[PDB]
Design a protein that fits this description.
The structure holds three protein chains of three kinds. By secondary structure, chain B is mostly helical. Chain B has one domain: Up-down Bundle (Methane Monooxygenase Hydroxylase, Chain G, domain 1), CATH 1.20.58.1880. Chain B is about 60% helix and about 0% strand. A six-stranded mixed sheet of chain C has the order 7-19-20-21-18-22, sandwiched between helices. In chain C, strands 11-2-1-15-24 form a five-stranded parallel sheet, with helices on one face. A four-stranded mixed sheet of chain C has the order 14-13-12-16, with no helix packed on it. The radius of gyration of chain C is 37 Å and the shape is elongated. Classes of the chains: A little secondary structure, B mainly alpha, C alpha/beta. The structure holds flavin-adenine dinucleotide.
């Protein structure tokens, strides 16, 4: 799942 | 509302996702039309290049020196006779008649139509102009 | 903000009562507003007291003594709140010192299948509630998908390694109880292309911004345009991204067409003017000859001959004036044609390099969700976003296995014990298991309740590794099918010396094709010893499991030599490659929200099973088969903390059934 992105965290669609 | 600069409409979505190859069909159809428009560009460029080649030198050997002279109140016989012929050729175009005589203003030309209406048969002269 | 921060750290709203609280305290929630605020303060204060010192048990006696007037007026209200929080595992969870040792007489018997974080967290709670608990584990170790590699001085995690922020995380409590060497991960992540040269700052920022714009657009497609079903099939995130990209390529072509269409319209406007000019130049030429012929009739003339000279003079100058009014209009259109030729729109939406860098960002998303983007639900892939913890992400430098090992203390765990069959009736339960080292050696365990923490990958197996008697109901098995179970792999490289930037925790490798985008795409520098860790994500993970360790490490070294230089990168001392899909006790990495599935399937996973009556006409029996694990918690799936919380939930549910509520 999305919350695990340590490197370059995505922002689009939150 | 979509993100600014991105383009997504209900119509465009349906066209791209209509079938398995609808996306590649739409993109290639626009690719062919881009080649088609560019071919037409090259065609008119070559047509215009030939037409510009015929206009070389412009109208420089055919332009006449501009001669200007002060307006006179008095009508000479010559100026009167030039006017009667100008009415025969140009009609009610008072600007044309003025440029022919050379030293009579647009207003003076208009007065000539009233002053000499009977003596120079201007009504008959204008009828001859309309008949052609 | 004191008591308000305690509610936040326990994932609760400080100023209102939850659904769970409404069930246990219906009198309060349906009552006056004043009593509710009294309840809320007692709840928040009790949590604060536990959170201030989680290394020792917080009793009702210690709670009431530290409460002030008028909140300590109602003593049975304080007792009800304390019991609620203890039962649901919001206070007194993990490893803490018990003030008065657990009662010697045990009530009820529970078998827990699996000794991962969910199993162990449930086991500790049930034991501290006074139940007889035994855990059955197929592996020779505890922890499950928390798996730490240890050889000599090298320590690296092959499973879970990142604590995803402390703000609201139950792992913050655990870190105050267990020595986890939590080290902050610096966000800075430079990307290096296939050649080995870094992506320039301007391009890197442009592609990332476009990536987030592309993601935002798929959300617009889902919610506003209702693009969720196509050809009677649920739309994936991958599908939606393709559609968005294709429509941007369409707009690039549409604006090109419109621009060159402005050129032809200007050229044809010029063509009509140039034809008009050529025809007028010929009329000017002819009328000039007619003038000069009349002019060469020398004076003295009669007045008609004089008129011919004068009228042809007027007519020629008028056409010369007309030509001049077309000659500057030619200039106006030639400069309009000059600026349009100088200002074209974009040639492409994205270049070959731009697409490759974008494929890195897609691979990064495929790592997070442990699955190719074509499997993710468009509507629901990010359903757990609102429950994200605050603060920096952290490495467990000690090795994450320190958590399950500490949770294992004082528990009856049967290692090397693979469950084969789960039997559940109105009278009780039978669990049939074998020794993994000697499969003919059979074990039977009789219990009141079974807690199943088998990974979703295991429950998916066809033919099954574990049989349920009677078979699981249709509503359960369909949820097992619909739900996604992803894959992700790690390559641990142990060196004698640091050849990389020691202040840089993360660096990326951009793949050549879309197909290989997740193949060794990201590197981690996290540990005290010289260790680099490489990820295999997306479609690559499943494929790279069929390739030997020597080849995978070879490809790792080739990438690193491109970035740092052939002489700078030595041969590794120790290497490990994880193969999680091949692992029979996991069969993948973690759950994802698949297309056709939703957050509701996680709730269905959590729902306990009630058997039929033995004798027909006997009263409705109690629930016997319970479920925990990362795949069973809607708000916190696919994580260690979610596994932890699922265990605490189920222990509270089992104790309510078998020891009575409150
Ligand atoms: C590569 C990878 C990286 C990860 N990184 C992170 C991260 O950075 N942060 C994070 O929060 N989470 C991460 N996770 C997820 C985390 O590891 C899991 O969500 C969590 O550990 C799952 O716990 P569980 O108890 O639900 O399942 P498990 O830990 O798998 O527990 C189930 C247990 O049941 C056992 N079992 C299986 N079959 C049988 C049988 N027939 N009989 C008896 N026992 C059986 C298994 O051996 C296992 O011990 C990662 C996972 C993977 C795979």
């Amino acid at each position: 799942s999305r919350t695990m992105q340590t490197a370059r965290k995505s922002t689009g669609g939150k | 509302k979509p993100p600014k600069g991105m383009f997504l409409s209900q119509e465009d979505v349906e066209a791209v996702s209509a079938n398995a190859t609808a996306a590649t069909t739409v993109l290639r159809q626009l690719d062919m039309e881009l080649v088609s428009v560019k071919r037409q560009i090259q065609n008119i460029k070559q047509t215009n290049s030939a037409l510009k080649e015929k206009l070389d030198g412009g109208i420089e050997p055919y332009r006449l020196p501009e001669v200007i002279q002060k307006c006179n109140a008095r009508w000479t016989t010559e100026e009167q006779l030039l006017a009667v012929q100008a009415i025969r050729k140009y009609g009610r175009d008072f600007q044309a008649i003025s440029d022919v005589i050379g030293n009579k203003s647009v207003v003076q030309v208009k007065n000539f139509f009233v002053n000499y209406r009977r003596r120079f048969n201007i009504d008959e002269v204008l009828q001859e102009w309309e008949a052609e | 903000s004191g008591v308000e921060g305690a509610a936040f750290q326990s994932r609760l709203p400080h100023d209102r009562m939850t659904s769970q609280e409404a069930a246990c305290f219906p009198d309060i929630i349906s009552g006056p507003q004043q009593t509710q605020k009294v309840f809320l303060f007692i709840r928040n204060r009790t949590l604060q007291l536990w959170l201030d010192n989680p290394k020792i048990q917080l009793t009702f006696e210690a709670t009431l003594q530290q409460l002030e007037a008028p909140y300590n007026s109602d003593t049975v209200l304080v007792h009800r709140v304390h019991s609620y929080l203890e039962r649901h595992g919001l206070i007194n969870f993990g490893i803490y010192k018990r003030i008065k040792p657990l009662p010697t007489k045990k009530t009820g018997k529970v078998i827990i299948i699996g000794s991962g974080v969910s199993g162990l967290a449930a086991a500790r709670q049930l034991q501290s509630f006074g139940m007889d608990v035994t855990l059955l584990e197929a592996r020779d170790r505890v922890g499950g998908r928390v798996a730490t590699f240890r050889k000599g001085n090298y320590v690296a995690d092959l499973g879970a390694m990142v604590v995803t922020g402390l703000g609201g995380n139950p792992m913050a409590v655990v870190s105050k109880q267990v020595n986890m060497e939590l080290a902050k991960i610096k966000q800075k992540c430079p990307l290096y292309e296939a050649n080995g040269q870094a992506v320039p700052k301007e391009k890197d920022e442009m592609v990332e911004q476009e990536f987030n714009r592309l993601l935002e657009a798929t959300s617009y497609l889902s919610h506003q345009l209702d693009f969720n079903v196509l050809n009677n099939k649920p739309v994936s995130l991958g599908q939606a991204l393709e559609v968005v990209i294709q429509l941007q390529e369409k707009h690039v072509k549409d604006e090109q067409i419109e621009h060159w269409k402005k050129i032809v319209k200007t050229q044809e406007e010029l063509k009509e003017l140039l034809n008009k000019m050529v025809n007028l130049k010929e009329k000017i030429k002819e009328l000039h000859q007619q003038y000069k012929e009349a002019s060469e009739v020398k004076p003295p003339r009669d007045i008609t001959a004089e008129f011919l000279v004068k009228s042809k003079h007027r007519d020629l100058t008028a056409l010369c004036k007309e030509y001049d009014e077309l000659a500057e209009t030619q200039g106006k259109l030639e400069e309009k044609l000059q600026e349009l030729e100088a200002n074209p729109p974009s040639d492409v939406y994205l270049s070959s390099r731009d697409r490759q860098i974008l494929d890195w960002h897609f691979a990064n998303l495929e790592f997070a969700n442990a699955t190719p983007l074509s499997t993710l639900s468009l509507k629901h892939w990010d359903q757990d976003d609102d429950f994200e913890f605050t603060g920096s992400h952290l490495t467990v430098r000690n090795g994450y296995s320190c958590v399950p090992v500490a949770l294992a203390e004082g528990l009856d765990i049967k290692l090397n014990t693979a469950v084969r069959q789960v039997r559940y009736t109105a009278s009780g339960c039978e669990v049939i298991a074998v020794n993994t080292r000697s499969t003919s050696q059979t074990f039977i365990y009789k219990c009141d309740a079974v807690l199943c923490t088998l990974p979703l990958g295991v429950l998916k197996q066809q033919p099954p590794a574990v049989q349920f008697v009677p078979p699981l109901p249709e509503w359960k098995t369909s949820a097992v099918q619909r739900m996604g179970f992803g894959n992700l792999n790690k390559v641990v490289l142990c060196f004698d010396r640091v050849f990389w930037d020691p202040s840089v925790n993360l660096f990326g490798h951009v793949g050549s094709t879309t197909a290989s985008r997740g193949e060794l795409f990201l590197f981690w520098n996290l540990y005290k010893a010289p260790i680099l860790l490489a990820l295999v994500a997306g479609e690559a993970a499943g494929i790279m499991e069929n390739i030997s360790d020597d080849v995978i490490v070879g490809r790792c070294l080739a990438i690193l030599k491109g970035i740092f230089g052939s002489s700078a990168v030595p041969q590794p001392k120790e290497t490990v490659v994880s193969r999680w899909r091949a692992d029979p006790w996991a069969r993948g990495s973690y759950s994802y929200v698949a297309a056709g599935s939703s957050g509701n399937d996680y709730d269905l996973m959590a729902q306990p099973i009630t058997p039929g009556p033995s004798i027909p006409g006997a009263p409705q029996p109690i629930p016997r088969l319970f479920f925990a694990g990362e795949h069973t918690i809607r708000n916190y799936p696919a994580t260690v903390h979610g596994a932890l919380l699922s265990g605490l939930r189920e222990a509270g549910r089992i104790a309510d059934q078998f020891l009575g509520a409150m």
